[PDB]
Amino acid sequence: WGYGQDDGPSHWHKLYPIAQGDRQSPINIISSQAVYSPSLQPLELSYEACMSLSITNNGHSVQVDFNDSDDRTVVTGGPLEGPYRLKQFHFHWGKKHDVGSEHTVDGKSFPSELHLVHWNAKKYSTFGEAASAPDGLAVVGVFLETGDEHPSMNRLTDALYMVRFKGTKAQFSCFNPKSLLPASRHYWTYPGSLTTPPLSESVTWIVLREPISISERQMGKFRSLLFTSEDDERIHMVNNFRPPQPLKGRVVKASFRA
Numbered sequence: 090w091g092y093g094q095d096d097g098p099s100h101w102h103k104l105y106p107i108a109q110g111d112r113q114s115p116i117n118i119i120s121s122q123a124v125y126s127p128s129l130q131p132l133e134l135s136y137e138a139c140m141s142l143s144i145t146n147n148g149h150s151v152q153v154d155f156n157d158s159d160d161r162t163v164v165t166g167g168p169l170e171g172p173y174r175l176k177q178f179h180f181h182w183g184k185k186h187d188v189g190s191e192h193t194v195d196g197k198s199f200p201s202e203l204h205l206v207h208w209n210a211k212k213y214s215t216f217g218e219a220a221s222a223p224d225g226l227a228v229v230g231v232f233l234e235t236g237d238e239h240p241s242m243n244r245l246t247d248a249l250y251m252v253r254f255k256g257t258k259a260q261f262s263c264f265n266p267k268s269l270l271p272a273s274r275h276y277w278t279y280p281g282s283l284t285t286p287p288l289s290e291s292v293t294w295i296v297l298r299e300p301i302s303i304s305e306r307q308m309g310k311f312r313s314l315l316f317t318s319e320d321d322e323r324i325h326m327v328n329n330f331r332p333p334q335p336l337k338g339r340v341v342k343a344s345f346r347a
């Protein structure tokens with residue numbers, strides 16, 4: 090599978106039937122339909138500054154992996170009943186400002202979306218094991234808009250050149266994912282799924298209301314990445330996102346009042 094004309098999202102159902110399930114992600118968030126839920130506890134992202142291991146171009150996105158041996162980088166609160174350990178973060182982006190995010194809000198897309206993937210290491214032995222259970226994952230999504238340069242983001246965008254080709258990785262020590270979070274912790278939450286095959290419906294989604302912004306120059310470093318390997322016809326990594334999927338009666342909760 091991929092994001093091309095022949096193996097893109099519109100065809101994934103041909104290989105993974107769960108693509109047509111009842112709790113698929115992403116979704117179009119209709120702010121007015123979101124249910125304000127004051128019962129939800131405060132969302133807390135407790136991240137350490139040196140838990141990052143490497144940065145990798147895996148052919149589908151650029152991903153930063155973390156040491157998840159313990160609870161030094163976890164997400165807790167909000168709709169979560171316990172702590173989920175951060176395994177990795179990656180991005181989805183487009184070829185222009187009007188497209189790139191997976192989730193959309195009132196029909197609006199952002200040029201990119203950051204996904205911080207956490208797993209329930211309290212009740213599952215492996216990240217892979219958790220990826221298959223309904224309460225296995227918790228992914229925090231952050232929208233990226235283009236505008237002013239993002240200082241901390243430079244550490245990451247400067248590192249992209251060395252992983253521009255599919256299958257290449259580099260050491261990426263002491264990068265604090267907290268540096269990519271907005272000043273607000275308000276969010277929307279709903280039960281969903283992985284947005285890439287196997288598309289298992291094991292994710293509790295937490296989409297932050299406030300986007301962070303990076304410069305167009307910074308965004309351009311992402312579009313410079315390649316879907317292809319070094320010895321192949323260069324195909325730039327762009328539009329690596331899955332479009333919104335049917336809500337199917339699911340309830341979208343919000344931690345704030347629109």
Ligand SMILES: NS(=O)(=O)c1ccc(C(=O)N2CCC(O)(c3ccccc3)CC2)cc1
Nearest residue numbers: 204206217220221228282283284285286287
């Ligand atoms: N965009 S997303 O939904 O936030 C997301 C979440 C996890 C992953 C992930 O960790 N991947 C993809 C799924 C994966 O390939 C897999 C394979 C088989 C079983 C379970 C997971 C493991 C690696 C990728 C994207």
Ligand SMILES: [Zn+2]
Nearest residue numbers: 179181204284
């Ligand atoms: Zn993702």
